[PDB]
Design a protein around this ligand. Structure first.
Ligand SMILES: Nc1nc2c(ncn2[C@@H]2O[C@H](COP(=O)(O)OP(=O)(O)OP(=O)(O)O)[C@@H](O)[C@H]2O)c(=O)[nH]1
Ligand SMILES: [Mg+2]
Ligand SMILES: [Mg+2]
Ligand SMILES: [Mg+2]
Ligand SMILES: [Mg+2]
Ligand SMILES: [Mg+2]
Ligand SMILES: [Mg+2]
Ligand SMILES: [Mg+2]
Ligand SMILES: [Mg+2]
Ligand SMILES: [Mg+2]
Ligand SMILES: [Mg+2]
Ligand SMILES: [Mg+2]
Lengths: 169, 258, 134, 219
RNA sequence: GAAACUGCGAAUGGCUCAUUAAAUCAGUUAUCGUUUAUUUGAUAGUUCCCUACAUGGUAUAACUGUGGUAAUUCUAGAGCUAAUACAUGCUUAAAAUCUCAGAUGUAUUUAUUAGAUUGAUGAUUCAUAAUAACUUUUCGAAUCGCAUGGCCUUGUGCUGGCGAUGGUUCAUUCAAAUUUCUGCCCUAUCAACUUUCGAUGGUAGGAUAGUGGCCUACCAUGGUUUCAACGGGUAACGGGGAAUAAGGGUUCGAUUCCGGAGAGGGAGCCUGAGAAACGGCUACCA
């Protein structure tokens, strides 16, 4: 619970240049809610022991039992960083800490309306791409919607462990 | 129920305070003190509703906390202090003294008194009893206990307390023909003279009272209060002298101002 | 000028509050709702004291017009005026103005969050920051 | 495993995360108020005798110094006990406390040095924490300074220089039980009141008995 | 002036009407059968078997510092630190009488005496006093603000104000608890009920603050009842009151005031003057 409870977190939220309202988008089975799990573990909200399987953003009973995502659950996180690299930011900056407002979109094609809502409501997009499956149809669709909504993507290539332990490349 | 109550709901207050029905939900609960709950007058009511000095409770509290009000010779800064029958309220600003006595209808009328007579205050002998170590004492109606009293003082007598030393200067003995003042009941506020005292052992002692206009009414011994000798009151009587005129005569007196 | 006749009835002088209480009976033909400020000024002039120990309030305008009746206060001095006037009347008049405090609900939740923390904030904030930062 | 090691003489404390449970097992089956040999805890602890006083297990439960169990139990705690601060006068609450016998379930053990041996250790003896608050009451500060009664302790008292606003105004403790002319006046006033009441009441008794004799003379 | 300790309050208020049919409640009595914080007034020269010009840490909070836990108004260890917190502990002679030099204030408990025909009551073993004693020791300010004065061997002097708070007891006041008399809707398709496990009473004790089968031991065989006991039903909290109202009535009254009960259901209990408290705790059931 790094997580300045609500009050100091909102105090930083007042500084509206070191806040990021971003949404994570990917293909159906590209592993986005697990990456958000690993990101929210550092907020002290879920144990590390249970990060990759406690899909904290997947909140519905179905979302947890079937290992899928349907709705978009917003999670808001506190982030401390170093003085050195905040100088290496091409953005207005006041302070050395940040507030991230993350949206965990569904990957399935049947739930792209939640991705559209998240894009309309956010401004940065984290595009998760499995290294094995590469660029699939749903990642194409979500990146197309983000570019239609004028949202800058940043790409993370996932499942390198799978590529290393299964493909032996 | 589970403890002493600390609020006094309006419409449960004593009637003679003449409180407005629709000002609030509550009436000033008399704090614990000398006289009683029912037959006392809080300084809040006496200062705001009887004298119209204060506009509200904050101003009554300010009056009391600037040591202006002084009851029975002491400041009595409590906002709901139970000032009762014949209590002397001395106000230094607007230097004037009140004796809190029943009017003819039974309410505390606003009755100015002089300083030389306001030096003292009068008390009904509630009991006479020999205390510890063999020291006799007298308890008066106003909760005052006085040591070493005259051995001839019995129950239902009356004593004048100096109010500076709190000691007996002179006293009236309860006998037929003594000026007595009615301190309860339907006849509350009436002044007369004892003619007869029916005993009724075990029950309630009765007394028959014949007022100055020869009207005779009987009241229980508990609420009859001697104030001296006929035509010679040892206290300053109110403007009405406790006559209890019939409504027709009262209406005629009102109509005489025309 | 308009015959704005400010009658003052029922004058009770209570030096207990160092003050004079009365009823003001402003007769104002052909004009409505006489201004509280000009009531204050005229009463100060009539009672030979500054317009800081005179107060007027509670004005009901007579049905039909031409008359308004309220209550008036006259302190002997501005100091006791400031001590005895309620703060709302003082702020209306122009004396020490209103305190900018938060909403009652906020205040209540604020003290409710204080009700949890036992000592001063520093002894627990050190531990909280240390722990969260590892 | 963590250990809060404290060195009370001259004041100090700090924590050691110990691991390699082989070099933890000596701290097992040990009661509270028991001494341990530092050698088994480590060769850098040669000559350290530690008195164990409490600790916290995993899941944060404080341990009770007299339960004598290696498992945590629910106990109804009272005003004058550990592990419970009553939130209302007379309140008693049932809380789970850890037993007095220390085992692997303990997250952190609390231990105080009661003997120093070999080469000193960093942050317990090189550092020294001064006492936060000097004596305030007259006779406590007298006993602290080894003075006698008639030594006028006002002349020198513990004085802290808070150089805050470029004045360096110094604050010293207020003195309690100080012999004061005001306290002596209060004592004299109380004695005078008692004697005056006694004399006045005796005079009243005499004159009332005189009145009784006078009124009984009429027979 | 943070926090904290201390103190006080949180037992009021407010809500609701589930239980409850002689129960609550209304009017009327009693406490000569009890507890009472607070207020108001009065009241305590008696203690000591090398500190009183003022005692102990047997004390600690807050704060510093080391923390555990996911989390709670969670807390442990280490370092202090105070009091009207906790615990101790004298100075007041003088006046005075009994016992063989001591004791004689008050508080607790018992016994005896007085309490008259030297106080009160309608009435007492009452108030109260005295005597002989007994206390896992009660109180009899080791407390605080503001002013400083009078004397004088001019000292670190002796005396001395107004207040606050504390405190034993008594009275009073806010009260509380029991309590007398009479008065509740329908029902006999309820006529006998109660009493082994208290029912009615006697004695003794226990417990209570006090009375009392309230509980126990012994003992008696009682007590309520067609003037309706007991049982059953109430979509019954009681009353002040409300609607309609020639008179008489009929119906309603969960609900602005008073009284009672309860805080999902039962039970138990801490603290406190006051709670069987639930915006207190503990446990069982849901
Ligand atoms: N080998 C490997 N598997 C991964 C990795 N990340 C996720 N997975 C697996 O991929 C599955 C999908 O994970 P999710 O958290 O549901 O994320 P998602 O694929 O975006 O699913 P949706 O949110 O429903 O779209 C999980 O069961 C993981 O086991 C990875 O980095 N390496
Ligand atoms: Mg997911
Ligand atoms: Mg799947
Ligand atoms: Mg009652
Ligand atoms: Mg019902
Ligand atoms: Mg009703
Ligand atoms: Mg109902
Ligand atoms: Mg009610
Ligand atoms: Mg209740
Ligand atoms: Mg409910
Ligand atoms: Mg309860
Ligand atoms: Mg409640």
């Amino acid at each position: 619970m790094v997580a300045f409870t609500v009050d100091q977190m909102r105090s930083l939220m007042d500084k509206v240049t070191n806040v990021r309202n971003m949404s994570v988008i990917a293909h159906v089975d590209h592993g986005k809610s697990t990456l958000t799990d690993s990101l929210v573990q550092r907020a002290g909200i879920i144990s590390a022991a249970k990060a990759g399987e406690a899909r904290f953003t997947d909140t519905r009973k179905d979302e947890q039992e079937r290992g899928i995502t349907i709705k978009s659950t917003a999670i808001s996180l506190y982030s401390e960083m170093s003085d050195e690299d905040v100088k290496e930011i091409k953005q207005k900056t006041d302070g050395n800490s940040f507030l991230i407002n993350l949206i965990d979109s569904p990957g399935h094609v049947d739930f792209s309306s939640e991705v559209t809502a998240a894009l309309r409501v956010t401004d940065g997009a984290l595009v998760v791409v499995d290294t094995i499956e590469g660029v699939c149809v749903q990642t194409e669709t979500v990146l197309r919607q983000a570019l239609g909504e004028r949202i800058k993507p940043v790409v993370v290539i996932n499942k390198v462990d799978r590529a290393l332990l299964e493909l032996q490349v | 129920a589970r403890g002493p109550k600390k609020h006094l709901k309006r419409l449960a207050a004593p009637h003679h305070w003449l409180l407005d029905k629709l000002s609030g939900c509550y009436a000033p609960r008399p704090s614990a003190g000398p006289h009683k709950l029912r037959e006392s007058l809080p300084l809040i009511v006496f200062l705001r509703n009887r004298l119209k000095y204060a506009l509200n409770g904050r101003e009554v509290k300010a009056i009391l906390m600037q040591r202006h009000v002084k009851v029975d010779g002491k400041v009595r800064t409590d906002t709901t202090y139970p000032a009762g029958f014949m209590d002397v309220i001395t106000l230094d600003a607007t230097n004037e003294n009140f004796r809190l006595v029943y009017d003819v209808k039974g309410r505390f009328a606003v009755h100015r008194i002089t300083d030389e007579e306001a030096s003292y205050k009068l008390g009904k002998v509630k009991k006479v009893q020999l205390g510890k170590k063999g020291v006799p004492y007298v308890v008066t109606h106003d909760g005052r206990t006085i040591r070493y009293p005259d051995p001839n003082i019995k129950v239902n007598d009356t004593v004048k307390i100096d109010l500076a030393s709190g000691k007996i200067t002179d006293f009236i003995k309860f006998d037929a023909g003594k000026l007595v003042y009615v301190t309860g009941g339907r006849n509350l506020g009436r002044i007369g003279t004892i003619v007869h005292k029916e005993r009724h052992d075990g029950g309630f002692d009765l007394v028959h009272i014949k007022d100055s206009l020869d009207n005779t009414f009987v009241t229980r011994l508990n609420n009859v209060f001697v104030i001296g000798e006929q035509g010679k009151p040892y206290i300053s009587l109110p403007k009405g002298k406790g006559i209890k005129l019939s409504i027709a005569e009262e209406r005629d007196r009102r109509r005489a101002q025309q | 000028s308009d015959a704005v006749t400010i009658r003052t009835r029922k004058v009770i002088s209570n030096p207990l509050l160092a003050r004079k209480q009365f009823v003001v009976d402003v007769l104002h033909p052909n004009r409505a709702n006489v201004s509280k400020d000009e009531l204050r000024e005229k009463l100060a002039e009539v009672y030979k004291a500054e317009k800081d120990a005179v107060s007027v309030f509670g004005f009901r305008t007579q049905f039909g017009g031409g008359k308004s009746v309220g209550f008036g206060l006259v302190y002997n001095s501005v100091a006791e005026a400031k001590k005895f006037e309620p703060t709302y009347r003082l702020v209306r008049y122009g004396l020490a103005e209103k305190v900018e405090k938060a909403s009652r609900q906020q205040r209540k939740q604020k003290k409710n969050r204080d009700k949890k923390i036992f000592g001063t904030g520093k002894r627990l904030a050190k531990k909280v920051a240390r722990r969260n930062a590892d | 495993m963590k250990l809060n090691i404290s060195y009370p003489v001259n004041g100090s404390q700090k924590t050691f995360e110990i691991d390699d449970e082989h070099r933890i097992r000596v701290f097992f089956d040990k009661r509270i108020g028991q001494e341990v040999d530092g050698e088994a805890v480590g060769d850098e602890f040669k000559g350290y005798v530690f008195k164990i006083s409490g600790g916290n297990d995993k899941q944060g439960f404080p341990m009770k110094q007299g339960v004598l169990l290696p498992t945590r139990i629910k106990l109804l705690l009272t005003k004058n006990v550990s592990c419970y601060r009553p939130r209302r006068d007379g309140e008693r609450k049932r809380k789970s406390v850890r037993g007095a016998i220390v085992g692997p379930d303990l997250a952190v053990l609390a231990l105080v040095i009661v003997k120093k041996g070999e080469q000193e250790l960093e942050g317990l003896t090189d550092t020294t924490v001064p006492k936060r608050l000097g004596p305030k009451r007259a006779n406590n500060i007298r006993k602290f300074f080894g003075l006698s009664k008639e030594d006028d302790v006002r002349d020198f008292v513990i004085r802290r220089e808070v150089t805050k606003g470029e004045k360096t105004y110094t604050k010293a403790p207020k003195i309690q039980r100080l012999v004061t002319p005001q306290r002596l006046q209060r004592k004299r006033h109380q004695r005078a009141l008692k004697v005056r009441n006694a004399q006045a009441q005796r005079e009243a008794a005499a004159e009332y008995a005189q009145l009784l004799a006078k009124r009984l003379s009429e027979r």
